[PDB]
Design a protein around this ligand. Structure first.
Ligand SMILES: [Mg+2]
Ligand SMILES: [Mg+2]
Ligand SMILES: [Mg+2]
Ligand SMILES: [Mg+2]
Ligand SMILES: [Mg+2]
Ligand SMILES: [Mg+2]
Ligand SMILES: [Mg+2]
Ligand SMILES: [Mg+2]
Ligand SMILES: [Mg+2]
Ligand SMILES: [Mg+2]
Ligand SMILES: [Mg+2]
Ligand SMILES: [Mg+2]
Ligand SMILES: [Mg+2]
Ligand SMILES: [Mg+2]
Ligand SMILES: [Mg+2]
Ligand SMILES: [Mg+2]
Ligand SMILES: [Mg+2]
Ligand SMILES: [Mg+2]
Ligand SMILES: [Mg+2]
Ligand SMILES: [Mg+2]
Ligand SMILES: [Mg+2]
Ligand SMILES: [Mg+2]
Ligand SMILES: [Mg+2]
Ligand SMILES: [Mg+2]
Ligand SMILES: [Mg+2]
Ligand SMILES: [Mg+2]
Ligand SMILES: [Mg+2]
Ligand SMILES: [Mg+2]
Ligand SMILES: [Mg+2]
Ligand SMILES: [Mg+2]
Ligand SMILES: [Mg+2]
Ligand SMILES: [Mg+2]
Ligand SMILES: [Mg+2]
Ligand SMILES: [Mg+2]
Ligand SMILES: [Mg+2]
Ligand SMILES: [Mg+2]
Lengths: 156, 208, 225
RNA sequence: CUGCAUGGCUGUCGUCAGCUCGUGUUGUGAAAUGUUGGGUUAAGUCCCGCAACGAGCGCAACCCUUAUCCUUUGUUGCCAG
RNA sequence: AAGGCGGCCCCCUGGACGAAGACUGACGCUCAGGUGCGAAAGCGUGGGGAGCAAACAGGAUUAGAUACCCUGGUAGUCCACGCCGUAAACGAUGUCGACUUGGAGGUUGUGCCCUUGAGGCGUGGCUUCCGGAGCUAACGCGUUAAGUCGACCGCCUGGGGA
RNA sequence: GGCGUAAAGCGCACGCAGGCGGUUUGUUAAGUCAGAUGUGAAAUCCCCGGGCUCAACCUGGGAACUGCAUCUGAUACUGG
């Protein structure tokens, strides 16, 4: 029931006395079709072990995102280390207008109508961290109503 | 160019010879040629049979070939049909009266020559070598081996650059002399070349 | 259940000096005597009783409790408290990943059991006597480290720690695993990773025995209840 | 003919004491820890300490031979009485 | 203010800080262009010239040695008055102001307690080190910010070519 | 968008023009905000429709033309 997407695989290296040792890294993201999203980053000498370590870490360290019906709640921004990221709630059925890693993370996030833009570095690890930070700090009308101590109708 | 053959190094301690006879120097190499020709013949005939170890013993000028195989039904056929067919040609080669016994190989997943020939047959019918090495290790560690190491070599997937790969599960002490390491090696003659397969299986230490 | 002059007699209000203190302990320090901060026992008592109330809730319903102190002064006291309330203890070094890598530590719980089986009941006489001494000092070391949790089987449900920095690793592993933390937080410690902060001294053997006997009490009372 | 298409086998650094993995943790990451430190050893040998806990290939031993003794059997070997 | 400033004495002189009060009453901040200061080396005129020392000379070294090493040694270094107007002129961090957990010092004032000792409790200026949140590509910075903000100025836009 | 180290803080400072400006009251209404009028050619773009067998196309009405001027007001902020 948790849909799982790998974003990108990459071969890294490590130079030793014998020569170059190659390894593989895997960036996977999981989600429940709702606000529960979580990513993982595994690494091994072999690709199925790296995707399995990534899905293993992604199934835990899940994060909860207060969605609306199928879209966001307010235009939110997210940063991590190279990637300022803008995302915006959109009308019904305009699709996921997003780049690379953000399409996979919002698709398993269960969003369906976004207008996104990734500025800066588009490294999938940091931009998926920047989207996780943006969706995590996106706040609902209930949370702001309980916070300000007013009703939702007093907030409009 | 580094490692000794683990059978030949274990031959005085925990492993038996595959030929246990005696002769003087006059009839030594003639008996050893007759043993070579009969192991050649029996391997070509029982190629589809999962034969592992042909033991030859000759008392009183009468050869006795003990075939170890995982299934004796295809080696025998009808009761004394194919065994008798192979017996009359063994007696033709050795020039002496023959006798054929068949020892069944319990657990064919724990015999290095059978695993190596299954991998070779799989590579010949073009399967992925990593899948074959995985299934050989998972089957052997499930069947109860204390440790297996497999290794293929050369022209993998038709690549022009030959490389080697090896998997290992469990402990395989080659330097331990009392370790029961079943070691054997097969060769796959693909259209891109020759792929060499080695397999070590550690069952445990004999406490003699 | 413990009065303020009870704490003042045991030495709970003592702490560390003014050049070792954490600025997060500002809402817990009463004053500063002899260039040493003084812990506000006015806020110590109702927080220690809130912790003992939640301890009485979990040990009422048979939650698993792990007592953690390896100060080489409260090691026997935390052992006697965990064997009083038949709970689990860590008196010698907290192994890195004792909770998170439980599935690896389990294979040494099993090794400690099989060595105890072999030697006491198993009578594992008749070995190579040099191996009989390597088995002996292995089993002594494993009992000295993992003997307090050898019957636990699973993850504990609450962790009571005597010092948040001598045992800061167990705080992080509990914070990862979602296990609640009850801790005697001194002036030189960080009160953020601890879910139930208890101000008080950490090196005083009388105060450690007061804390532990009050916890082994409200657990035995919740078990019997 | 091609060892620069390969198997197998062999040299070599080097019988040097090293090389790695699993889970965990740290770091955006390449990676790191473990494997480092205090001693010690022929040895990543062992002990203690330690966010590591464990495990594998190797380091050692198990093999052969020599060095002392015992029992058994004494020819084609032996000669104390 | 920066460059920079090191025996002692006198003369002239600028700035900083502290303590109580008194006073003026926003008189303030920044600054293109502009003006002024601005290490060493260098230039001009006039002196001076011990030591050091570019250049140069000789000796070695070296395959060579227009170098390092050695023995010498001239401008220069010094003074007066002018010019030049540059440095890795660096904290490689523009100036002014406000707020934001701490610790150990150094220096320089000053208040109080019986200074019952050179102590005890504070309150200002400047300064060094470590380090938390936060920030940062990381290194690291971290109340003297490279944190959070405001005002103004200067500058950048791939590497050479330059 | 940046300027410790990747390009980038003038060597430092004073300072004219310029930019900015503590707090209180009163007043002004310049900026600002609201409304009205005039204008902002038509076409074009957009919306709702109509017509060519449909569409392209043609076309009706509207909105829009984010602007400027004048007048009537408002006085929090900035300015005087
Ligand atoms: Mg990680
Ligand atoms: Mg870019
Ligand atoms: Mg060799
Ligand atoms: Mg070659
Ligand atoms: Mg070869
Ligand atoms: Mg690891
Ligand atoms: Mg190493
Ligand atoms: Mg060491
Ligand atoms: Mg070892
Ligand atoms: Mg060895
Ligand atoms: Mg006045
Ligand atoms: Mg200027
Ligand atoms: Mg000069
Ligand atoms: Mg001159
Ligand atoms: Mg002159
Ligand atoms: Mg002179
Ligand atoms: Mg000279
Ligand atoms: Mg310059
Ligand atoms: Mg400097
Ligand atoms: Mg500069
Ligand atoms: Mg200025
Ligand atoms: Mg610092
Ligand atoms: Mg900033
Ligand atoms: Mg700043
Ligand atoms: Mg910066
Ligand atoms: Mg830029
Ligand atoms: Mg540079
Ligand atoms: Mg630069
Ligand atoms: Mg500067
Ligand atoms: Mg004003
Ligand atoms: Mg006004
Ligand atoms: Mg007006
Ligand atoms: Mg208007
Ligand atoms: Mg028009
Ligand atoms: Mg129509
Ligand atoms: Mg006014």
């Amino acid at each position: 029931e948790l849909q799982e997407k790998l974003i990108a695989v990459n071969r890294v290296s490590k130079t030793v006395k014998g020569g170059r040792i190659f390894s593989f890294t895997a960036l996977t993201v999981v989600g429940d079709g709702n606000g529960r999203v979580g990513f993982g980053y595994g690494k091994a000498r072999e690709v199925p072990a790296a995707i399995q370590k990534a899905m293993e870490k992604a199934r835990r360290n899940m994060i909860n995102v207060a969605l609306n019906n199928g879209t966001l709640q307010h235009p939110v921004k997210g940063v991590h280390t190279g990637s300022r990221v803008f995302m915006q709630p959109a009308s019904e059925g305009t699709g996921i207008i997003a780049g690379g890693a953000m399409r996979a993370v919002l698709e398993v996030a269960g969003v369906h109508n976004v207008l996104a833009k990734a500025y800066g570095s588009t490294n999938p690890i940091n931009v998926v961290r920047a989207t996780i930070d943006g969706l995590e700090n996106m706040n609902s009308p209930e949370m702001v109503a309980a916070k300000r101590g007013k009703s939702v109708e007093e907030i409009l | 160019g580094q490692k000794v053959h683990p059978n030949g190094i274990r031959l005085g301690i925990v492993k038996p010879w595959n030929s246990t006879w005696f002769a003087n120097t006059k009839e030594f190499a003639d008996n050893l040629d007759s043993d070579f020709k009969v192991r050649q013949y029996l391997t070509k005939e029982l190629a589809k049979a999962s034969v592992s170890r042909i033991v030859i013993e000759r008392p009183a000028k009468s050869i006795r070939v003990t075939i170890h195989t995982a299934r004796p039904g295809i080696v025998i056929g009808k009761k004394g049909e194919d065994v008798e067919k192979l017996r009359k040609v063994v007696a033709d080669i050795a020039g002496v009266p023959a006798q054929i016994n068949i020892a069944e190989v319990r657990k064919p997943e724990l015999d290095a020559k059978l695993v190596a020939d299954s991998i070779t047959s799989q590579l010949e019918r073009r399967v992925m070598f990593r899948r074959a090495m995985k299934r050989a290790v998972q089957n052997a560690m499930r069947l109860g081996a204390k440790g297996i190491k497999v290794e293929v070599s050369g022209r993998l997937g038709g690549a022009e650059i030959a490389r080697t790969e090896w998997y290992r599960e469990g402990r395989v002490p080659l330097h331990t002399l009392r370790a029961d390491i079943d070691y054997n090696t097969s060769e796959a003659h693909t259209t891109y070349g020759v792929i060499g397969v080695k397999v070590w299986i550690f069952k445990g230490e004999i406490l003699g | 259940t413990v009065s303020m002059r009870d704490m003042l007699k045991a030495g709970v209000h003592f702490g560390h000096q003014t050049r070792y203190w954490n600025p997060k302990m500002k809402p817990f320090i009463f004053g500063a005597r002899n260039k040493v901060h003084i812990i506000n026992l006015e806020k110590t008592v109702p927080m220690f009783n809130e912790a003992l109330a939640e301890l009485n809730k979990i040990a009422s319903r048979k939650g698993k409790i792990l007592f953690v102190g390896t100060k080489r002064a409260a090691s026997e006291a935390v052992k006697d408290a965990a064997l009083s309330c038949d709970q689990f203890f860590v008196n010698h070094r907290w192994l890195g990943g004792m909770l998170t890598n439980w599935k690896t530590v389990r294979q040494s719980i099993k090794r400690l059991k099989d060595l105890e089986t072999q030697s006491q009941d198993g009578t594992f006489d008749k070995l190579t006597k040099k191996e009989a001494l390597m088995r002996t000092r292995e089993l002594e070391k494993l009992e000295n480290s993992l003997g307090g949790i050898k019957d636990m089987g699973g993850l504990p449900d609450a962790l009571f720690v005597i010092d948040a920095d001598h045992e800061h690793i167990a705080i992080k592993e509990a914070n990862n695993l979602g296990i609640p933390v009850f801790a005697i937080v001194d002036t030189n410690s960080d009160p953020d990773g601890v879910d139930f902060v208890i101000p008080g001294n950490d090196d005083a053997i009388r105060a450690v025995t007061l804390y532990l006997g009050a916890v082994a009490a409200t657990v035995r009372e919740g078990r019997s209840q």
